[PDB]
Amino acid sequence: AMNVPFWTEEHVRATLPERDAESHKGTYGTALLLAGSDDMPGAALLAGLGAMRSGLGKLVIGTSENVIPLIVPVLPEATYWRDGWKKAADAQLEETYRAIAIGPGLPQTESVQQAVDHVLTADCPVILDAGALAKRTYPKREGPVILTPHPGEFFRMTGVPVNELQKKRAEYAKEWAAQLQTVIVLKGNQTVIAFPDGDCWLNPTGNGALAKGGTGDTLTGMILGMLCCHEDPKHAVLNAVYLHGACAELWTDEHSAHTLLAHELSDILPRVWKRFE
Amino acid sequence: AMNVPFWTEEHVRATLPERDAESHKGTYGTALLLAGSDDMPGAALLAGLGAMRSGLGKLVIGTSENVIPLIVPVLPEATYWRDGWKKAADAQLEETYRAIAIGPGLPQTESVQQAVDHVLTADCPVILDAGALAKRTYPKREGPVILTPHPGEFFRMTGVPVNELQKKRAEYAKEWAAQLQTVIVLKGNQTVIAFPDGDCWLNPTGNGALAKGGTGDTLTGMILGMLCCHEDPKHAVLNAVYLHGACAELWTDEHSAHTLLAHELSDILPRVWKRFE
Amino acid sequence: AMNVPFWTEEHVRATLPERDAESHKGTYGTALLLAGSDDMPGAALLAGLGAMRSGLGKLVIGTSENVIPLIVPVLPEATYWRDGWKKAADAQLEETYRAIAIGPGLPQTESVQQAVDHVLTADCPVILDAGALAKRTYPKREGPVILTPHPGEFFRMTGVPVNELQKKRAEYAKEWAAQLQTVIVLKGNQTVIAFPDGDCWLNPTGNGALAKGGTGDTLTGMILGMLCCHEDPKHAVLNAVYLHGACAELWTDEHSAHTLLAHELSDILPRVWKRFE
Amino acid sequence: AMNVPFWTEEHVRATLPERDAESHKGTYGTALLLAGSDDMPGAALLAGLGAMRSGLGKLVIGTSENVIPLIVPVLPEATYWRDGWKKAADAQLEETYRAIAIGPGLPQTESVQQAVDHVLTADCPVILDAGALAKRTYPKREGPVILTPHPGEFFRMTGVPVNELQKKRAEYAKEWAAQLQTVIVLKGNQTVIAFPDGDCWLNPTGNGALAKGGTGDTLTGMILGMLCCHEDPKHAVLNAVYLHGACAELWTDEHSAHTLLAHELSDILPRVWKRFE
Ligand SMILES: [Mg+2]
Ligand SMILES: [Mg+2]
Ligand SMILES: [Mg+2]
Ligand SMILES: [Mg+2]
């Protein structure tokens, strides 16, 4: 009813970055991923793979010590900050990162919020997902804050019940992005990308193959990596959400939508991204 | 001699569910898999992969603590109930599941039967396989109980010797499904699917590539996932058994039947399922 | 100079077994693999994959406790006898196996020889490889003993120096198979398969892609599995050696011979075996 | 400005080795890889895969004890020297190796330099990378020393700031290869391969897909393996750098350059190498 525009293929093609011959990994930046706990380990692998697939230069995974050995054989290109998400509860980060994500596979605790508060004093874009999503406010800072809730997490954040939210998704997402002064990626069919400056878009890609555990962890990583290779973080978010959906669409050409596993979205992205170049 | 009908391709096509665009993982439900022990760990990975491939929304694996790290790198989309199958011996489940499977890679012990008794107080379909199969009776409850014995396990359950069973497979399977008031999937060439209401079918798919360790663990998971995406649990069982066999048939087109590994059935299912859509 | 015949494609085609529809995993038997130590773990994975790919019904891997978790994610279809190769030093096996292999990734110790002595009291074919190969004699027993030395191991076994061996490979292999009353698979280009009854063949397949660590561990497993699905153990050995080589030849059609990894031979076998059916 | 020639396809084709039918793994030699620490484990897997893909006969990985289990499931063909890189700080090597690499995933410490000093008393080519790169001099010895710095590591080695280095890359690389009497592979677009005898080449292959963590670890392993199968170590270095780049070029034919993971370069090398045969 607000006639929110779709972020279309033309917009993706016009905004995806080049990876020029005169580049080194420093050009594409170091991301930090604060994810994975002994109790929810897989989220770190999913987000890690998403991030490294998505154009960053280096990835540091601040996961629980016992999760590290589960990532290495699948993603030997990542490096680690041992118990990083826990350590971040106690002190500001000393290292400079191009972008930070926090939350996948983390519990919904006060200590995770202390880590969030410390990460927000860095000067870079920050993504909050999953256990890092809470009812709270955000400090004025350098760099966007990007929240990636599903409708239940949106309810947790705002008190808008899911059954009311789903009637006016873009209207609520826009209202709350403005109130919180954060980007809100409100997941679902026609995911809403609402910006604090009032810009808002709908995502046209994806299908029900995505309605399964782990696909949002993969998306968080994709956003994290795209923030490292796009100069404009708005375009990084929009392109990540778009390409994530497009990977599910490629899957369903020859595979049943009931059968996708989230990690495969990362495996598909190389060929899908090429098509938009 | 009872002229039991085959569950044919036409029946599969008519009964497989859609995965609509307006869906979220909640629509497709959360399964619980109680499987894998330090001594038989692989069954949990096989059943877990089968289940997540088969249309569920979320999977919780209640496996032994030491088995968790063996699953994560292969199936990072699963989450865990640490020592769940052991914990279930002591108390009713507090969480609501769309469907439950118990037994793959579990020992044939009294404690496993205590877990079975507790799981049966939930209101959902329950599958019993492998170490959860015993000579016993079943309480009247909400939701079907689905037993998946090979002939040796059927003997354990009923006292019908294997050499007598194999002469009259459907007759015995039907008699015992009625007596126990459980679904019985009696494995073998022309697997029998006998329902407590007296309906009975034969499975027409599969071949000797399936006669190797682990393929039944994969089937248990497939049934578990299909119970989450079919409204009619009878159709979930029949389609799982059918599609499982059809994956072996696709394998033998270009691969020797001596060489299949069970996990590959899960890897094949995406393309096989698409063909029946 | 002895004009030893090649075991040709025609012989392979004529002797490979069917996997009929009326089969269960019991038909194809349970193999035991005693392999892998904390210090040489990979051999157990290589031999395990080879064996399960090669037509057995079930595989029990008696490996060191710390090696088990390294196998599971890659070969979840195997089951385990925890510290089996060590336990076998102390007592006769209580379980019946269709075939047994011992040695890959095991140290060349007296305790490994005690395990060999205990395994030889079983009534089944037994393969000795790697650390199980020693200068020794063999008891009269039911079932063939199959030794799989490379030339250096042959020297260890017999005192024939490698430089003399390599001049008269089939003559030495035949002489020693007769003296020991064991099958000897003497590895190398034109691997020699010498039988204690004086039959002897050369293998015509393979290439230098096989001249890299691990390819013999894969072969041991292939022999183990083929012993489970062939009625004639002589044919199992000959076909395993043949098909192993044929997998390397398929690799070199589109890949450099310098670049093969042994586990890939197992991955290739499904398609190669189909061609000989 | 020095008109440094490219090491071209013609030069690669003319210098790559055969793998003849009359070969055994001994012909192709045993490499030692001293890499991977609890804090940087992935480098050992990347370099290990690179090395085993690159024509060696055997690989021993002297990595930290806790890293071993992370390598095995992916590279079961490798064997181990438990805590080898640490042990090498204390004593000369007792075993003979065809080639040695040290440094990927190792900290920049004095103990790593003690290991380097001990490895240099062996008579074989030695590669120093990553944490093994330091400001130092090198003893006259049998066998080349090959340093593989990125520009920041070159600065660490020489005191030439990166912004000055990048203006005159070949001039600085040549000057320092001569001064140190080491081979210097100075990474970047148009990687420089400078020899202590004053020969110098530019690498013409590669693209920005390589500007991501781990691709240099993969290169170190590729050089290590190629040193084992080339008689001329100069040609081994040049061909490794060339083929490494060529793998990235093959990737970008159908995949976005933003999306490559380093381990995939190893997976691509089999087909790329075949093309140059
Ligand atoms: Mg989520
Ligand atoms: Mg079973
Ligand atoms: Mg051997
Ligand atoms: Mg480096």
The Cα–Cα gap between D212 and B194 comes to: 56
Strand pairing report for A126-128 and A145-147: parallel
The Cα–Cα gap between C235 and D125 comes to: 46
**Residue-by-residue DSSP string for A132-157:** G--S------SS-EEE---HHHHHHH
The Cα–Cα gap between A67 and A80 comes to: 10
Q: What token pair was written down for D111?
A: 């103990």
Q: Is C114 helix (H, G, I), strand (E, B) or coil?
A: helix
Asked if the Cβ–Cβ distance from B212 to C72 is below 8 Å, we say: no
Closest CA to D203 of D242, D258, D163: D242
Cβ count within 10 A of residue B244: 31
Closest CA to A264 of B272, D49, B77: B77
The Cα–Cα gap between B90 and D112 comes to: 53
Which CATH entry fits the domain spanning A1-277: 3.40.1190.20, 3.20.20.370, 1.10.10.10, 1.20.1560.10?
Answer: 3.40.1190.20
* Residue C45 contacts D where some CB pair is shorter than 8 Å: yes
The Cα–Cα gap between D140 and C118 comes to: 55
- Report CA torsion sign: D123, D124, D130, D135: positive
The Cα–Cα gap between C276 and B120 comes to: 50
The residue ranges of every structural domain in chain C are 1-277
Alpha-carbon distance B141 to nearest alpha carbon in chain C (angstroms): 34
Cβ-count burial of B139 within 10 angstroms (0-12 exposed, 13-18 middle, 19+ buried)?
Answer: exposed
B contacts of C68 (beta carbons < 8 Å): 41
Place of tokens 């200068």: C135
Contact residues, D window 81-100, toward C, CB-based 8 Å cutoff: 82
Q: Are D221 and D54 in contact (CB under 8 A)?
A: yes
Chosen for mutation from A71, A72, A243 (greatest number of chain D CBs closer than 10 Å) is A72
Asked if the Cβ–Cβ distance from B76 to A43 is below 8 Å, we say: yes
The gap from C-alpha B202 to its chain's centroid, in whole angstroms, comes to 16
- 3-state SS of chain C: helix, strand, coil percent to 5? 45, 10, 45
Alpha-carbon distance A14 to nearest alpha carbon in chain D (angstroms): 15
Q: What is the resolution of this structure in A?
A: 1.6
Per the DSSP assignment, residues forming a β-bridge with A60 are A32, A79
* Residue B265 contacts C where some CB pair is shorter than 8 Å: no
- C8 appears as a binding residue in the annotation: no
Q: What token pair was written down for C263?
A: 């586990």
B contacts of C53 (beta carbons < 8 Å): 259, 261
The breaks in chain A (C to N more than 2.5 Å) occur after none
Burial string for D133-171 (b: 16+ CB within 10 Å, else e) reads: bbeeebeeeeebbbbbbbbebbbebbebeeeebeeebbb
Alpha carbons within 13 angstroms on the beta-carbon side of residue B142 total 5
What are the distances in angstroms from CA D168 to CA D172, D173, D194?
6, 9, 13
Chosen for mutation from D72, D218, D242 (greatest number of chain C CBs closer than 10 Å) is D72
Per the DSSP assignment, residues forming a β-bridge with B200 are B194
What are the distances in angstroms from CA D11 to CA C185, C245, D207?
41, 32, 20
Phi, psi dihedral angles at D105 (to 5 degrees): 65, 15
Rounded distance from Cα D140 to ligand 4 centre (Å): 25
Q: Are C247 and C265 in contact (CB under 8 A)?
A: yes
- DSSP for residue C67: T
Asked if the Cβ–Cβ distance from B57 to A209 is below 8 Å, we say: no
Cβ-count burial of C111 within 10 angstroms (0-12 exposed, 13-18 middle, 19+ buried)?
Answer: middle
Rounded distance from Cα D142 to ligand 2 centre (Å): 61
Sequence-separated (6 or more) residues with CB below 8 Å from residue A135: A156, A157, A158, A159
Cβ count within 10 A of residue B26: 15
Alpha-carbon distance B206 to nearest alpha carbon in chain C (angstroms): 8
> Amino acid letter at D138?
Y
Q: Are A183 and A195 in contact (CB under 8 A)?
A: yes
Rounded distance from Cα C235 to ligand 3 centre (Å): 21
The Cα–Cα gap between D47 and D148 comes to: 13
Choose among B45, B254, B256: nearest Cβ to C76: B45
Closest CA to D143 of D103, D101, D201, D172: D101
* Residue B24 contacts A where some CB pair is shorter than 8 Å: yes
B contacts of C69 (beta carbons < 8 Å): 41, 66, 69-70
The Cα–Cα gap between B123 and B97 comes to: 8
